[PDB]
Design a protein around this nucleic acid. Structure first.
Ligand SMILES: [Mn+2]
Ligand SMILES: [Mn+2]
Lengths: 302, 295, 929, 165, 295
DNA sequence: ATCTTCCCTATTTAAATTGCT
DNA sequence: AGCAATTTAAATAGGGAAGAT
């Protein structure tokens, strides 16, 4: 007993998405993909900072980025490849006095549901935060091992039953429970309207710097890989007072709301893995949450 | 005054207010002292309850319980009872537990039947939501409430353990709480210590649901010491499990409406007792435990 | 339990209590109830009989003793229930009460004459500095002294004369000097910086003539001429007749004032000052509203002009007169007759029947309870208090947790919260986890109790929760600092609440040896003040030194002389009750206390010595104490272990010493399985509390429940390195201890932490005393001053413990009990006794215990500071983030057995160590790195 | 005047106010605010709130506006039409910053650029701290911030739900 | 709201006769038919009883039940040999401790476990005799009483059926009742419809032990409707086992002593209070069902 | 002085009535 | 039916004065 957790214990990320490159298409002209360019407009304004009152007279020529659709294409296309990898129970930096006990404590994990919610967050449009808002038509095409799947009307908040997501979830759960990998090429086509302004992900700027950096690969608007990884693991409906699916965190913590849902109420990942290697009976939902964290990965040492 | 409720189907639950209950001409009668004296039918009655301003005598009590009519003491409306006997087969020539109790207790033993009946009690919470539609309340068949209902049904059906069932309980109850807060334009969280009108009206309605669930469990001879969902150390968990059938369907819209107009507690009592009388909520709980126990 | 409740209440309140007392007992008719109830039934009846309102007149009898008496019902002195009650019972030569009335009335009509200067008027209106150059009490004293020098101050018309700046206002007339000291010290006492005056002044006026304006009143002094130009708008009807009637009252009674002794004058003027601040704060708290303008005294919360000075003086006078009347004519509310006390003690509590050898009708009692630990000392103290009748006492104890332990003993034996009041004035956040319903512990702060009649004379109806628990408690289980302020304070009215508390209640001070020397001086001052009003002092200390026991008896004897000559009764002596676990002895002692006390001490020593030796201590020869600790740990594990598992306590002196011993033992390569704990006091709220509860549950050896809190399967050395926080108030039982020597009472107390719960005698040696303290390598001139009575005035000639202690010795209380003044420079015990008789002496000095003449001054509260510590700033941990220069560090992780983490709380760092980083750590708290 | 509620729900992934602003934009672009439907917000303390409240005198039904906000249905909630004798009506307040009025001084007074800087150099630069929304304007192709504050009730409203004059 | 007084340390004890029980000005009281109003200490009452001509009201019953006072009605016996039917209002509004009912159910449903509990409870009356020894009447440790309880223990040890338990029950009751008859030199036959003082003192003690047994069972939430001893003659519920554990130890020697000394019924009421209070027979019964439930 | 009788003296209990739930 | 508010009034307690031994 009293199997104390290793200080070096970490797990690798098992859902690896690429950067979500963003293109402009039409709804019936889906093959002509023109890359959405981040424009950048200059704004003239004096600097106002707390530490330098002497520098407020002149300076701060700032040039803020923006990204709209072109005025001939009404559909935004978002392309990214989500790579699910198996052996989520292998610790990369941990070892096997604790990670092997985790293997033999989370073998009864229903990966079917875990994978369903992953592919449902892929398909329903959780990966399209501010640009699925106000779109009159949502479409998702998933290409997986030469199989094409079409999704039109999936409400993203609840994980309802559709056999299309389920079909992919099968091979995704077979990867995640076993050994190997699977790759889902996900292209989202959302009809926002003619010249509607799109929403790339944001680089962190300083308190000063410029107003807003949109995410650029080679000049073209895109969204962060870790931001999509936040979308995919947004499956946590099993904490106490669970209203909406949150991103599976080791503490159940969302930064933008200023509260942590699983921290400080004995449902955090660390107490559940210590309970698993000390062998108390877990329910299915918290064990699924622990396996979702191990799929997410991260260093758990102290 | 007097009033009539039903349990199985026959009008048998009779609540007496204001009337001293005595015996005249060898028959049990009652004297609304605020008026006259009326007799009580015997063949169609088994349950008699006594509200405020009411005194029964020993000889009337003996004749009442000697003819199969069993007596309980309650708050006004007959939906919060604090004093009764235990239901047996017949109250004269035998003293054995009720079939319903025995069935319940065997259901209690098998943990698989416990899980199964837990499920059935949760299903009937959703059934109550529908059956008992409110004019002032939200529609149940709209997209958000039906999405919550099918999410709860899919969660209960696919559940294999009790902890997942209680997690689904928490998310269903909050979801209905946040949706009724959504339509009433408030930011409501369920706290029993909270001093606003919505929470304390919900707490009072929960107490009246506990009382009517206690009457429904007592009416079939089943003690409230056998919780389906709640833990084995929770005192009176079965009365909480029975009251959860009507708590999210009847107590919640009545309490939110009565906090919306913001009137006092006595006509909130009157609204709750009137809603229990008109749609026979105690009868539906009786038939609920009927279809729970016999299978 | 069969009780009988009789009620003689009037009005409809009589009927409202009848519902509750008829809910719990049967009605026998004629407003008398009688029946069988349970212990907690009596409590629920108390709680809902007192809370129902004011005017409840309820007497309860359990068998034939009175259970409780609600209100000031006279009820029973011999028989119970009177008949033709009426007034004018005794009407004596009260004399000293008329003296206190005259002094308080004359001073209270003159206490705020000095607010009439123009500076105080613009201070209240707010166009100058709110701090006066000279305080208004001194200006009123200048007014009264100038009026006395000009006209005959006792029988003349008043008229305020032209006053100037006077450095001293104290003359020779003893009564005038009393009135002047009451006027000047109605806010704060004068402080004398002068060393020759502090050296020599003893008498009443002869010390009072040294109280000048420079002792706090003369703040800055640039607007003195405006501070002494005064208007005379007080000459009205009711003020002049009140002044005339009180002055003539004093005139008629001052003939008995010269027949008093010094001790009387000091205690009577202390009572007068306490009643004067009571009346002044009572009238300053409430808002009277009406005013006659042109002159003002106080300000409201809005700063508007209120309480004009004529009616302010009149209100302070009547409130102080009423304060005096209720504090001098109170039959105070006592505790319930606890039925689980009065039966006979069985087995190891069988000595508690010594109360059947004490007289139950003695007006005074000085208990010296020399019983050893584990015998139920506090239960015996409650038994001794209940032997004289109903209980009214203040259990003043050191530490919060020891008050919690005595409260839990009082709760589970027989005492409810209608009689008990646990007071810890810090609101600590140490909560009980695991199960709130299945706790049956964690004595809390509610005090259903009964509000005393003294709350109406305090400011704004006493206070909220805390002072209601202070004043109105029958039994006040409190930390001691809520009682030592009775002897007096620097600034404010914080003296009055413990003063009026200790006036009508007994005082029970347990383990007074753990306090400091100045702390023990002010505790014996409190003992003298408690004995000044006839209450009984119970001292409960096993390791008492004759010096301490003597000076506490002399303080009680001076107090009982005050009480005897105050009621005009001839002083027969003090009923001293020597008590231990082997016997009791009650003697009427007016003189020769020393031979009787030493004979009882020798009898207790002979009753301790034929018992088997439980603590055999060997002083090690190894000079270096690090490897001495190593070798002693190895030896006492190889000799003293319970099947391979042994518990060791390394008692060291200070915190960096503790972390040095810990960091050496963690890096110490050995075949022994050392498991190290740090147990000093510098720890965060959470971490510290966690250590406490764990240690209390693993070192409990009365049963084998600890086998499940540690790994006793594998042979392991469970070592706790601790500072003197382990030797005070800890119910710990170690297999053996290694002691760094600081004082001999530390040796006796850490012997009391070894085999505290078991009765098995050691074979070879269970204590290994280190050769030197670790301060020898840092300061060879003085090394025992930290946590010891060595100092700069009392230096050991040699620091070798072979020279100053026995090499093999059975350590018990005998060396501390005996008392030796000779050879104090080369033995630790005689060094200890020397200091104890040279600081707690029968003199008045200035920081001494018989203090007379200086009680009038602020000197015993400035130069004798209770809990005199270092500056002490508090670095606070807020959610894992430290406040000041802390820098969390990482411990050695070699042998730590248990380490609890902390996130909130605070650490107490001396200002000396604030310069550098305290470097807080999870294992060991504060150090120098 | 009878009124209807549009409460933004489940907008945590996206700010609540972005959904509120998109609700305003979709209510603008598909008609709704012809001249008589107005908006109000029950929870302006420092944020604009999460409830849009439409108090049209003729009466707003659920069906027309739920067909209008078909795009926001994933995170919207619509209450049944209730009544209110008094609604707390807000209006539009706009900000000007330097060059704005400079171009006005180009086109109204006909003065040169340097003297237009000269008359306005030490002036202007007001800073509105009122609660606001962020609006896509479609006729003028740039996106801006619109400030709302409490004013006396007006009979006529704009195409956005705020008071006129 | 405090600890509400635990039931085992409740002390007061009444059976009210020829008085209407009401509430005046706060307290529960009883008013006889001459104008006399005697207050009932409801916070310390274990049970009240209601004889012929008694009549309790609603809020009086509520103040008894919410405080936790079990209330029965003495009349109802109509057979020739049996105390037939006693009607008993349980305070179920206080939600009870649960796992003691679960333990009682797990021993009740298993037939061999019910027989094992039947065994220990039959020797519980034997040890009751040994513990509760009166100063008057017989001595328990004489040769005849020890011989009959030894034959009883030997026969109940080798028993295997509940009808054998009923037969041995009958020989035990005949043996004790007749030995007490011999000591008090009277001829004794147990008829509940007899004018002899040894009989109606025994029926008064039947009512007293009934009230003690429902307060002991309700203090642990145990229903009367689970009789571990059952039969044609023995059909009263669990009260006719936890009530006659203490006949031949407490009531029957006290009833014979009261019928031998021969003052009124009130000395017998007060003697039942005195012996149920001094030896803590209620807490003794509760602690015995405690060591029954967890074994 | 002590004690009793009687007159204030008003303070102190018990009944009576009656909306209110 | 219990209670509460609130009146109404009968009575209980006490203090002062005066008359006895
Ligand atoms: Mn002052
Ligand atoms: Mn003052």
């Amino acid at each position: 007993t009293k199997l104390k957790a290793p200080a070096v214990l970490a797990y690798s990320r098992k859902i690896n998405p690429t950067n979500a490159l963003m293109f402009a298409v039409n709804w019936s002209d889906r093959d002509n993909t023109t890359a959405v360019m981040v424009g950048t407009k200059t704004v003239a304004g004096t600097q106002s900072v707390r530490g330098n009152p002497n520098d407020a007279d002149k300076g701060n020529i700032q040039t803020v980025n923006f990204a709209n659709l072109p005025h001939n294409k009404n559909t935004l296309l978002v392309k990214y490849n989500v790579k699910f990898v198996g052996d989520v129970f292998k610790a990369e930096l941990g070892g096997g006095e604790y990670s092997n006990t985790l293997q033999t404590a989370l073998e009864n994990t229903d990966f079917g549901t875990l994978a369903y919610r992953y592919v449902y967050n892929i398909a329903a449009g959780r990966t399209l935060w501010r640009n699925r808002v106000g779109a009159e038509s949502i479409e998702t095409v998933i290409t997986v091992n030469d199989q094409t799947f079409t999704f039109s009307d999936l409400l993203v908040n609840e994980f309802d039953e559709d056999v299309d997501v389920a079909e992919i979830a099968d091979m995704v759960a077979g990867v995640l429970s076993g050994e190997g990998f699977v790759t889902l090429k996900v292209e989202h086509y959302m009809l926002l309207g003619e010249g509607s302004e799109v929403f790339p992900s944001q680089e962190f700027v300083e308190n000063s710097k410029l107003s807003k950096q949109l995410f650029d690969l080679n000049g073209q608007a895109a969204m962060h890989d870790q931001k999509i990884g936040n979308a995919i693991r947004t499956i946590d409906t099993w904490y106490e007072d669970a209203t909406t699916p949150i991103a599976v965190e080791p503490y159940g913590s969302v930064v933008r709301n200023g509260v942590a849902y699983r921290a400080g109420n004995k449902t955090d990942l660390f107490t559940l893995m210590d309970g698993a290697v000390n062998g108390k009976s877990l329910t299915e939902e918290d064990q699924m949450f622990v396996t979702a964290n191990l799929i997410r990965g991260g260093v758990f040492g102290g | 005054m007097q009033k009539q409720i039903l349990t199985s189907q026959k009008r048998n639950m009779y609540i007496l207010s204001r009337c001293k209950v005595l015996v005249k001409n060898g028959q049990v009668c009652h004297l609304h002292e605020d008026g006259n004296v009326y007799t009580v039918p015997y063949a169609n009655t088994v349950f008699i309850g006594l509200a405020e301003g009411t005194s029964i005598t020993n000889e009337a009590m003996s004749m009442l319980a000697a003819n199969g009519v069993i007596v309980f003491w309650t708050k006004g409306g007959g939906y919060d009872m604090f004093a009764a006997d235990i239901i047996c087969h017949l109250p004269q020539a035998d003293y054995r537990p009720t079939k319903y109790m025995q069935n319940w207790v065997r259901l209690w033993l098998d943990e698989e039947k416990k899980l199964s009946a837990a499920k059935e009690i949760l299903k009937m919470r959703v059934d109550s939501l529908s059956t008992h539609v409110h004019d002032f309340g939200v529609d149940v068949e709209n997209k958000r409430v039906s999405s919550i209902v099918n999410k709860f049904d899919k969660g209960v059906t696919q559940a294999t353990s009790f902890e997942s069932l209680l997690g689904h309980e928490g998310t269903f109850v909050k979801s209905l709480y946040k949706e009724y807060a959504l339509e009433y334009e408030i930011e409501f969280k369920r706290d029993h210590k909270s001093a606003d009108n919505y929470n304390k009206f919900l707490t009072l309605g929960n107490y009246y649901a506990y009382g009517i669930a206690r009457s429904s469990l007592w009416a079939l001879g089943i003690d409230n010491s056998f919780p389906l969902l709640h833990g084995s150390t929770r005192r009176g968990g079965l009365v909480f499990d029975v009251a959860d059938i009507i708590k999210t369907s009847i107590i919640l819209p009545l309490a939110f409406h009565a906090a919306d107009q913001g009137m006092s507690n006595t006509e909130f009592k009157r609204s709750c007792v009137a809603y229990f009388d008109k749609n026979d909520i105690l009868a539906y709980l009786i038939n609920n435990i009927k279809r729970l126990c016999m299978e | 339990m069969f009780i009988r409740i009789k009620c003689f209440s009037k009005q409809p309140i009589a009927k409202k209590v009848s519902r509750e007392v008829s809910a719990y007992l049967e009605y026998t008719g004629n407003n008398t109830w009688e029946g069988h109830i349970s212990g907690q039934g009596v409590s629920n009846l108390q709680t809902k009989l007192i809370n129902v309102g004011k005017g409840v007149k309820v007497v309860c009898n359990y068998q034939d003793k009175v259970l409780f008496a609600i209100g000031n019902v006279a009820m029973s002195d011999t028989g119970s229930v009177p008949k033709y009650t009426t007034k004018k019972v005794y009407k004596p030569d009260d004399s000293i009460f008329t003296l206190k009335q005259g002094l308080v009335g004359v001073a209270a009509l003159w206490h705020d004459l000095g607010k009439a200067n123009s500076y105080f008027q613009r201070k209240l209106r707010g166009e100058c500095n709110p701090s006066d150059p000279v305080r208004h009490e001194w200006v009123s004293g200048v007014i009264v002294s100038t009026f006395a020098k000009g006209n005959d101050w006792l029988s003349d018309d008043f008229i305020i004369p032209e006053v100037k700046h006077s450095d001293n206002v104290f003359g020779d007339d003893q009564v005038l000097n009393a009135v002047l000291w009451l006027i000047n010290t109605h806010h704060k006492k004068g402080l004398v910086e002068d060393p020759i005056y502090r050296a020599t002044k003893t008498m009443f006026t002869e010390t009072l003539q040294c109280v000048n304006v420079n002792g706090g009143w003369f703040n800055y002094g640039d607007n003195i001429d405006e501070c002494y130009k005064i208007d005379t708008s007080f000459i009205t009807d009711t003020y002049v007749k009140q002044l005339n009637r009180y002055r003539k009252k004093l005139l008629a009674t001052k003939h008995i004032w010269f027949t008093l002794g010094e001790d009387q004058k000091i205690a009577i003027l202390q009572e007068c000052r306490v009643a004067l601040m009571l009346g002044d704060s009572n009238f300053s708290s409430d808002l009277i509203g009406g005013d006659g303008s042109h002159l003002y005294a106080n300000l409201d919360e809005c700063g508007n002009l209120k309480q004009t000075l004529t009616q302010h003086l009149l209100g302070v006078t009547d409130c102080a007169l009423k304060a005096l009347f209720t504090i001098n004519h109170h039959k105070p509310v006592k505790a319930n007759f606890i039925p689980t006390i009065a039966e006979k003690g069985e087995g190891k509590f069988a000595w508690q029947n010594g109360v059947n050898m004490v007289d139950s009708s003695i007006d005074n009692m000085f208990c010296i309870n020399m019983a050893s630990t584990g015998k139920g000392k506090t239960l015996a103290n409650l038994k001794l208090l209940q032997h004289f009748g109903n209980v009214r006492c203040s259990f003043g104890l050191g530490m919060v947790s020891l008050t919690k332990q005595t409260a839990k003993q009082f709760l589970d034996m027989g005492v409810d919260y209608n009689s008990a009041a646990m007071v810890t004035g810090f609101s600590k956040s140490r909560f009980n986890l695991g199960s709130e319903s299945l706790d049956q512990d964690e004595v809390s702060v509610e005090y259903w109790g009964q509000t005393s009649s003294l709350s109406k004379v305090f400011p704004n109806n006493n206070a909220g929760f805390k002072n209601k628990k202070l004043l109105s408690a029958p039994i006040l289980v409190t930390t001691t600092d809520h009682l030592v302020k009775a002897s007096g304070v620097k600034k404010g009215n914080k003296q009055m609440l413990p003063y009026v508390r200790c006036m009508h209640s007994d005082l029970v001070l347990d383990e007074i040896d753990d306090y400091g020397i100045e702390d023990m001086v002010v505790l014996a001052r409190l003992v003298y003040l408690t004995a000044c009003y006839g209450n009984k002092v119970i001292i409960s200390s096993a390791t008492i030194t004759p010096a301490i026991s003597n000076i506490f008896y002399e303080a009680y004897s001076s107090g009982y002389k005050v009480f005897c000559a105050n009621k005009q009764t001839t002083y027969k002596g003090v009923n001293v009750v020597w008590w231990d676990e082997f016997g009791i002895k009650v003697e009427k002692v007016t003189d020769q206390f020393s031979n009787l006390n030493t004979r009882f001490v020798n009898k207790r020593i002979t009753n301790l010595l034929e018992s088997t030796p439980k603590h055999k201590a060997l002083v090690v020869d190894q000079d270096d104490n690090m490897e001495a600790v190593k070798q002693s740990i190895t030896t006492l594990h190889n000799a003293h272990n319970s099947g391979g598992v042994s518990f060791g306590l390394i008692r060291t002196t200070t915190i960096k010493d503790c972390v040095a011993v810990t960091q050496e033992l963690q890096n110490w390569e050995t075949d022994l399985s050392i498991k190290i704990l740090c147990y000093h006091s510098r720890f965060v709220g959470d971490t510290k509390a966690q250590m406490e509860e764990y240690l209390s549950k693993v070192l409990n050896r009365k049963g084998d429940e600890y086998k499940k809190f540690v790994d006793t399967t594998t042979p392991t050395a469970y070592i706790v390195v601790a500072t003197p926080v382990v030797e005070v108030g800890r119910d710990f039982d170690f297999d053996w201890a290694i002691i760094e020597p600081s004082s001999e009472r530390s040796i006796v107390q850490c012997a009391g932490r070894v085999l505290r719960h078991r009765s098995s005698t050691p074979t070879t040696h269970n204590i290994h005393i280190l050769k030197y303290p670790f301060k020898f390598y840092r300061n060879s001139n003085i090394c025992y001053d930290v946590a010891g009575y060595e100092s700069k005035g009392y230096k050991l000639k040699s620091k070798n413990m072979l020279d100053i202690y026995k090499k093999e010795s059975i350590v018990n209380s005998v060396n501390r009990l005996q008392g030796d003044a000779a050879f104090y420079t080369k033995s630790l015990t005689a060094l200890e006794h020397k200091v104890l008789l040279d600081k707690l002496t029968t003199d008045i000095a200035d920081t001494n215990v018989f203090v007379g003449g200086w009680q009038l001054t602020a000197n015993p509260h400035e130069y004798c500071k209770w809990r005199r510590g270092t500056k002490n700033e508090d670095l606070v941990l807020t959610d894992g983030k430290w406040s000041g220069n802390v820098t969390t560090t990482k411990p050695i992780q070699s042998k730590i057995w248990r380490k609890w983490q902390g996130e909130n709380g605070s650490i107490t760092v001396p200002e000396y160590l604030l310069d550098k980083t305290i470097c807080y750590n999870d294992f060991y708290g504060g150090y120098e790195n | 005047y009878n009124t209807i509620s549009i409460t933004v729900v489940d907008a945590d992934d996206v700010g609540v106010n972005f959904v509120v602003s998109k609700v305003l934009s979709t209510l603008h672009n598909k008609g709704i605010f012809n001249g008589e439907v107005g908006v109000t917000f029950p929870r302006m303390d420092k944020n604009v709130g999460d409830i849009i409240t439409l108090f049209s005198k003729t009466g707003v039904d659920r069906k027309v506006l739920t067909s209008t906000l078909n795009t926001l249905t994933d995170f919207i909630h619509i209450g049944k039409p209730k009544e209110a004798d008094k609604v707390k009506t807000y209006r539009k307040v706009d900000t000007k910053s330097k060059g704005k009025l400079i171009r006005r001084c180009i086109k109204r007074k006909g003065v040169s650029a340097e003297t237009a800087e000269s008359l306005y150099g030490n002036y202007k630069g007001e800073k509105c701290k009122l609660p606001y929304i962020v609006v896509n304007s479609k006729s003028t192709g740039q996106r801006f911030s619109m400030f709302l504050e409490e004013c006396e009730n007006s009979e006529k409203f704009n195409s956005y739900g705020l008071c006129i004059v």
